[PDB]
Subunit: 388 residues, 4 copies
């Protein structure tokens, strides 16, 4: 068993992840800044497929049009030198004090207009660099108090913003799709579109829903105590999993962004099983923060660990589904029956089917055990490589 990643595994990382300097709400940075070129090179050596960026990670805020040009050219050369791709980009609408009440849903109308112009400028840059997905994380869209934000008006403003971005992309003929990244809270007390479900429901109200999907993050759904593989299954069912952010989280608390596989390990196993079996073909993107206890050697070790843990879990999930004892257990728990229509015979035949009600033996049905505990222990054995 060797678990070395290759660019064909499509592992990607944000510039902001390995480049996080370790500033947290109670302390100063513990690491120096990383040159984006440096990160691209180090990640390529680790076996990564590509990188992602916020506008402000690549071009420092307030850069002159020409300093801009210069930063991009250096970056493009590093991409050329290494074979690294840029599959996704996003906008920083949360760090600058002007976004303290939000970007697209700020109460001040002039700030909402600025937020849109800042976004459109980076969409152009993303397309140039070849990105196929443009992510939006509305980190400042929300409130700490009840009267500060009329949420129906804010949702109108949010729809207005995304509809305009969709108009722009279509008018320019760009081949790029949008992905909304939910988070329930932090840094705002409550953030709008707090879960995968709220984001999926919102998308259905946009003018061109086909251009929008979700970019769920493992830790964010877990901050609401939700089951991440279930949420991803709903997103896949809807045809809306455009991208995904992988990391780890230990429960309901502040957003930890631990390396993937840390946090809830069994959820990571069921997630990998689902992604691989559904044939998800997008990037396996890591949105994580190497802990501020680490020096740069620790940063690269943490990034390598993300990829390693994905490949180990992939191997264990494949072994699980391939095991004939597990296929027998699946039939014993009637997963095969779950996949069959309830009533392909139609409503009238169901209504006339006396075996469905009048003469249904409910006591016999109730006595049938589901055998889920044996199945789950087979999954545990596979995960731990303890199959005897």
């Amino acid at each position: 068993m060797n678990y070395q990643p290759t660019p064909e595994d499509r592992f990607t990382f944000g510039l902001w992840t390995v480049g996080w300097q370790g500033r947290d709400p109670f302390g100063d940075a513990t690491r120096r800044a990383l040159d984006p070129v440096e990160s691209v090179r180090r990640l390529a050596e680790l076996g990564a497929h590509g990188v992602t960026f916020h506008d402000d990670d690549l071009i420092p805020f307030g850069s002159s049009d020409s300093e801009r040009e210069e930063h991009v050219k250096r970056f493009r050369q590093a991409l050329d030198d290494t074979g690294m791709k840029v599959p996704m980009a996003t906008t920083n609408l949360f760090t600058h004090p002007v976004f303290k009440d939000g970007g697209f849903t700020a109460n001040d109308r002039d700030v909402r207009r600025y937020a849109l112009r800042k976004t459109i400028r980076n969409i152009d840059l993303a397309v140039e660099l070849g990105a196929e997905t443009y992510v939006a994380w509305g980190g400042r869209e929300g409130a700490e108090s009840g009267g500060a934000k009329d949420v129906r008006d804010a949702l109108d403003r949010m729809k207005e913003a995304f509809d305009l971005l969709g108009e722009y992309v279509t008018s320019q003929g760009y081949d790029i799709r949008f992905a909304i990244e939910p988070k329930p809270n932090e840094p705002r007390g409550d953030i709008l579109l707090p879960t995968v479900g709220h984001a999926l429901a919102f998308i259905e109200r946009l003018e061109r829903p086909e251009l929008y999907g979700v970019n769920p993050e493992v830790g964010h759904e877990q901050m609401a105590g939700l089951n991440f593989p279930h949420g991803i299954a709903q997103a896949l069912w809807a045809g809306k999993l455009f991208h995904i952010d992988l990391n780890g989280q230990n429960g309901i608390k502040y957003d930890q962004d631990l390396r993937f596989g840390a946090g809830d390990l069994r959820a990571a196993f069921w997630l990998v099983d689902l992604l691989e079996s559904a044939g998800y073909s997008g990037p396996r993107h890591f949105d994580f923060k190497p802990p501020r206890t680490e020096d740069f050697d620790g940063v690269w070790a943490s990034a390598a660990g993300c990829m390693r843990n994905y490949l180990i879990l992939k191997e264990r999930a494949a072994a699980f589904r391939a095991d004939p004892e597990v296929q027998e257990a699946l039939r014993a728990s009637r997963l095969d029956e779950l996949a069959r229509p309830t009533a392909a015979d139609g409503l009238q035949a169901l209504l006339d089917d006396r075996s469905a009600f009048e003469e249904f033996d409910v006591d016999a049905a109730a006595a049938r055990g589901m055998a889920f505990e044996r199945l789950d222990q087979l999954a545990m054995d596979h995960l731990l490589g303890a199959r005897g």
Copy 2:
């Protein structure tokens, strides 16, 4: 200030609420069963508008077709005697052991067929009694372990079930709509459609989405640590708030179903403000459990408290919105600007607007305080009746 409810306030209660005998997972019942007729009469005396029921609350499971007839006739006479209405009904698909792996998404296909027939039978009864809304709470739809439930297949089965019920209602020409009640967990480890957002997104995939809305419950969204007024605002924005369940919950733990106003009192204030200001016109339904510490006098006191606390909060929220100091504060925090379109001028004019980017003074914008803390203290003063 007098806070007496009248049937015009549209307060409703489930039979199962005041009739809960106090059985919990660690203990026996502490109260005798209540005769549904008794409950209808006592609730009418308290000023309630009507009652709701599960099929099994009104007709004990396994009743003969004629015992059935008899239970309904007694109930109808109590409704006639008191003027009480029956605006909503629902199905019990969770108590009987045959539903231990779910009703609509049970792995066993014969159980899913039985679940549909049990539901259809009660829809007929609901229409007869005049209900306008039929609620579905999929309490057993979910799993304790990862391999027990393929969630895409389960969502296919769930869609299949709701599509069939919609076919039935339309074919019968019934004027009744469906409302899905989300809950994140309990009694299953994770329940499918765990929040208002997931339910709204699911509805958009049904064949006739116009027949389906949500029935959110205060405590259930709070079990995921979510902001209930925000979720209700999203549901109103979508035109899908068909019904609502009011109660109290203290945080992320087991489903407490405390009387309304208990639990998170400020959230109750912002909820009432939103409902009243959005002109929600459905029932104000209480889905609550009088604590098992109480005798029947305590049960009626708890039910009266539900209604009282709604009317006090209604008065305080109205006073808040009517106060000219608060209207000035709202303008100071630019709630008026939030309600104005960001770019009614259109995309091209936004792109050509140099005041939106090239010459936007971001530092000046960032320095503007939002004045949210003064506004929130005005709301606190109003809530506590301390306005000086």
Copy 3:
């Protein structure tokens, strides 16, 4: 690698665990009751060391003094027939409606007196059967509302109860110790002594603290989002880990009592590592509920899984600590330095040590990485059996 338990592994189970009939707050029992004799025999065949009981699990509430005698004799014969031991016993002070406001801290004084007499009667029975530890879980001690319970008076009543039980045991010359089992909530809204920490602090205020320790349960500390291995380390540090309850829990929600190893698997690994390395010598007791989806075959599979997962994790934790690469990593992260006194030289020498402050190079110290991410990935590799 074979993972078969033997009675020498000291695995124990409560009668109430495999015997749980599957009644939950939303549904009826799905399994018939188990005869305690049946359970003892089945558990012995699985490799268990012994069983535990509540008074009411073994002798149905309200039994005549002679029916009592009969139930105990049958039980003792099953113990004799199988070699099974009874290391712990406890009292049911939560199921009967008379305990709806608590046992030791009920507001009614006559109920508190009854609670003490019911307890003392079972202590006598526990000693007869050879138990060394008597557990107290104050499941009903607490409140749903603020005014219902003066908590200082309730703590006085709680101390009074435990002091009296300690007087009784000493006066009778019994060799038995007490263990308090914390839980933060459920079935009460908030339960008194909600965590391992509150229980340890309370014990220090009893008249004979040496007779009392804690019986922490994995899932219960996790219901407060706490780190269970940390809490156990504090209990070991204090010399108060008298017993332990092993199971699994997925986060902050209702008390799931899943089989051990389910729920937070990495926490289970760090717990086993700590128990084995601290040389904890008491029973490895499982307080778990086989899910109500299961028939009796599923019940025994779930119980076997508890033991299996302990032995797999024991093997992986031992391999981790024995690996020379891990010992090197531990030194690299300065775990050796953590175990050395900070200032064995004493206060004055610390005050006079200029290398401790005046001439301490804080920048050099701050630049040293802790190398925790490499260490944690070594632990992950060991846990998953992926060491290359």
Copy 4:
């Protein structure tokens, strides 16, 4: 009803609270720094009694011995000019990168020695300024991963540190006591001594326990989903409430530090009731952060709101306890009986009391309702000023 604070209400604020510049983990500061002298003056005008500080709030880290002298003299003059007191001080052992793995429990021994010297230096300064309480918040004491911290060794190091500080204070003859401030997590993944209970238990293992108490913070116990008034009652029962930090928190999430009265309003009511009725005489200290949405006018409004909400709740709790209808309800719920000993007659008389068991009517006892819901609605009415 007028709710103006005076210095006699003993309201205090940390320099770091109104002086928080609004830097959060996702964004830059939104406010300029405040001169400590400026804060003292503004707080005095608001009616505050005094201020508290971390060493680094008052003297910027790395200050020369003489720059030090200068900062203190300016501060002392502002205190003299306004009549403001300094009742508590504390050490910053969390911001500087050298504390990234902790201060007292850092794995590096030289960092632990530095942490102690930095603390001792500020204790001297605290005594000079008249502080009576010295707080310790071990924000960096903890871990993100299982192997990084042996918690028994860390607790040995923690005890060693506090024992040395107690030696120092006694040797110097200072009249100052220590208060440990628990927090469950953030900025570390898990923090040692995570709740009031763990801190109380730890204190009992110090060499001179009488010198140490707790400084609980409303939001911190709520981050573990615990009931703060209950925890404070346990701390009062133990004689260990040396100080308290007041603020608001909405549930289990990141540490919000909202103004007092925000967050869980009913918990704030029950807390004030308990503090006032137990005659707590220390400072009413606010550890809060004015939201980063605010300008300086908003900062002062938020600080004023802290004090206002305390005085409103004080008035409502006093009215509640003074109301004869409430005293009757308290007797009806048998709070009077809770305060009476269970068995002042002693163990033998309890054992011989047949009314306690043999002839106890359990059914009659069980039928008695506790009347807690009526009592809680009286408390609600009082809180909302709706008593009819």
